Design a protein around this ligand. Sequence first.
Ligand SMILES: Nc1ncnc2c1ncn2[C@@H]1O[C@H](COP(=O)(O)OP(=O)(O)OP(=O)(O)OP(=O)(O)OC[C@H]2O[C@@H](n3cnc4c(N)ncnc43)[C@H](O)[C@@H]2O)[C@@H](O)[C@H]1O
Ligand SMILES: Nc1ncnc2c1ncn2[C@@H]1O[C@H](COP(=O)(O)OP(=O)(O)OP(=O)(O)OP(=O)(O)OC[C@H]2O[C@@H](n3cnc4c(N)ncnc43)[C@H](O)[C@@H]2O)[C@@H](O)[C@H]1O
Lengths: 394, 394
Amino acid sequence: FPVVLVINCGSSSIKFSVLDVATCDVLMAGIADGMNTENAFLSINGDKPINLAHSNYEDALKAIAFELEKRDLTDSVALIGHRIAHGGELFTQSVIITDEIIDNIRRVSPLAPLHNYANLSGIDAARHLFPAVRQVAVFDTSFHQTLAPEAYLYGLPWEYFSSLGVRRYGFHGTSHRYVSRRAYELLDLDEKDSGLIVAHLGNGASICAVRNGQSVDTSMGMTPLEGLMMGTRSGDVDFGAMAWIAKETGQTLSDLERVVNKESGLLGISGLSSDLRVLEKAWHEGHERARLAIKTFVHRIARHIAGHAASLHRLDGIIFTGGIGENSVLIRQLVIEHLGVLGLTLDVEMNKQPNSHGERIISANPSQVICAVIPTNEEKMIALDAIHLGNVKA
Amino acid sequence: FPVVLVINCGSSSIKFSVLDVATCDVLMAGIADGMNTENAFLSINGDKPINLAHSNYEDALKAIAFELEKRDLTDSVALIGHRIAHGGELFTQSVIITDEIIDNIRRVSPLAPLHNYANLSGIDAARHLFPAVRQVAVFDTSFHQTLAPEAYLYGLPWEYFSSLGVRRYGFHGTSHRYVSRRAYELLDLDEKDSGLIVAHLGNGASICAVRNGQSVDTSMGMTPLEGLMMGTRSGDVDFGAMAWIAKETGQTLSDLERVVNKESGLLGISGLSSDLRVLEKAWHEGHERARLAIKTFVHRIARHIAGHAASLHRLDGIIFTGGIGENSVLIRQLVIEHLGVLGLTLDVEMNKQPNSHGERIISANPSQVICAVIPTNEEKMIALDAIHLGNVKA
Ligand SMILES: Nc1ncnc2c1ncn2[C@@H]1O[C@H](COP(=O)(O)OP(=O)(O)OP(=O)(O)OP(=O)(O)OC[C@H]2O[C@@H](n3cnc4c(N)ncnc43)[C@H](O)[C@@H]2O)[C@@H](O)[C@H]1O
Ligand SMILES: Nc1ncnc2c1ncn2[C@@H]1O[C@H](COP(=O)(O)OP(=O)(O)OP(=O)(O)OP(=O)(O)OC[C@H]2O[C@@H](n3cnc4c(N)ncnc43)[C@H](O)[C@@H]2O)[C@@H](O)[C@H]1O
């Protein structure tokens, strides 16, 4: 009864899950949190916030490793999956982790230094604690590697691309990939003659155009800062505006980077919260800046969905996913009503249904494009990649 | 036989034209150039590049004022029209210039300091040299003042909007307005139940969604730096990318501002020229970076056209205009082929025709959206506003 241990070893946390290989069901989940800090803890299933004060990335996983052993799981771990933030141009698919892969992840790390050096910290720990276990790296950029240069180039001087690697990469690749594969079933589409837009709407948020099974445009950039407005991120912002602000307030690029990344977005406009549930209720209670944040948020989503549609030969489906996309009856409806130009017709009884109803269509019959909600499952996508790679000879 | 003197008094030049009131035809045109410099000259109709070494904004216009008098035109100048770069939120239409208007243009000047202080330099000169002549200010931002907050807000903290006025303004307002008014005739549309996208494609470039006669979205930002890739401007650029470059090369926000504004775009990608004719031929001659610049250029136009379409209830027309939009058979075709998702069908015999054929439809009958080329005429739009305002009592 083999299992897969999935790890996302972020800048300040290690989220993990243990999935059964035969059914891909979660048997255990958890989050080590407050990493590299004095107050570090490990909450499995939100059941016993066990203190692990002053603990590194390997300590957290050595904690977790014991918890699997306390449950006799350690000896069924046949595979380990690692979520990697950034694969630059080197990674176009998931790979069995070897010394070469480590070097290569290390080479692309300058593109996402905070997050990639935490991913490597996690691989290092896992390799120690599970030496006879095959391990697999799954990159959030890799699905977007099929973008053409016209879709990934910035209008900067060519020098910045060829010597410094400045180009669009895009993220949420594992979600976009997973969700698009699931849409071909739900919508009864032929992958190889199909056109989808996937709106991954969580705390971080991005659109992806998937033409014939392949990503052909996505909204995030070299960094997660491009495209949609999100929880705390501004989304697309006029560089001339940012330069004008600099002069006016004395702020530096670094300062404004923090603002754009940590204090902007739903949080920034509303002045209340990055949380959409909080803001939905605030609007309901007559809050005006909450209403503006959401309307702005919706408008930028509508605008990118339509804009990413231009990279398709035909639009068969729009799929919503993520915490916001799976759960917000309002935002889904607002966005879809903002896309009447594309011929969309919402079915509000279908749109009203909670996420418990799973993969589900939410558009009427007259609708020229199918709209659906498809809960993402990144941990399952990582495990399926791991399972496949478990049959390989290295 | 009254005439209107139209002036665009830019950062380094004064373009002018003299239009007949009864027919709106150009009787005289010219460009004072190399302003605030040692080598300053005045080329009327490209006929006698008259040297005017070391001359201010009033000297240039005093030169021009004499040339009108040498042609007995000075005494038929019934109206003067001034092109203003930026009207902030104060100007929503064209106005008879008074002391109040001057103060107000001066108040909004921090939003576009280079260009607005040159506009005021031009008003100052014209007011002196033509004291009994009614004068009119026409702002490139004013047409976009009908944008809703959701369409003009950035995802920055609310503070930056309410105290510093950081919002989208958009430009090419006079062109977008002019061209959209002309499209209602060409396409036999009712202005009040209509949806247009106008692609103003020149050296500077922007899209505008015009719903029921009103601008509801546009691609430029607080500054001309947002949206489309253009001649020397990058267009939309990931702020995270720009911050990453800063760290890597030691460059400042100011440095990167210059790069983004003056060295990027068609120029930047190709390494050859900001000129599209040069690049069309370069591609034809097998040049790869010329081909990439154009493809990138086209792709970002297609993406914004479709994205601005989301702000319409229905898409009746896409209109091309500007030096590139009026004259590039290739780019028009490429862009339209990149929008097959919207149901466009090009008529290539119609698309092949040069600009001499004027306002013209370039789409087939099956096409679900009419596509057209409509030569812009900003000087005529300014004069028509002036003519109307000549009937007012101040
Ligand atoms: N610089 C960088 N470079 C490279 N990689 C980087 C990076 N920075 C970060 N990364 C990486 O990017 C990856 C993804 O990061 P994120 O983009 O931040 O993660 P996410 O997909 O938004 O998922 P999350 O769980 O945070 O939000 P959820 O969908 O629950 O959605 C939460 C939202 O859903 C809403 N919601 C939930 N239920 C709701 C309901 N019933 N109604 C309305 N809203 C609801 C909530 O209110 C909330 O607003 C991470 O691995 C991270 O390490
Ligand atoms: N920071 C700021 N804030 C506020 N306001 C500001 C500002 N900076 C500037 N402004 C103002 O914005 C206004 C507009 O500026 P711009 O945006 O720069 O002007 P434009 O509309 O591009 O017109 P231009 O004449 O330069 O180019 P054209 O259409 O001929 O098109 C030229 C192109 O067409 C191409 N072309 C011509 N014929 C062609 C053919 N046959 N085939 C292919 N291409 C052709 C050419 O190759 C060339 O590439 C100005 O008043 C300016 O002062």
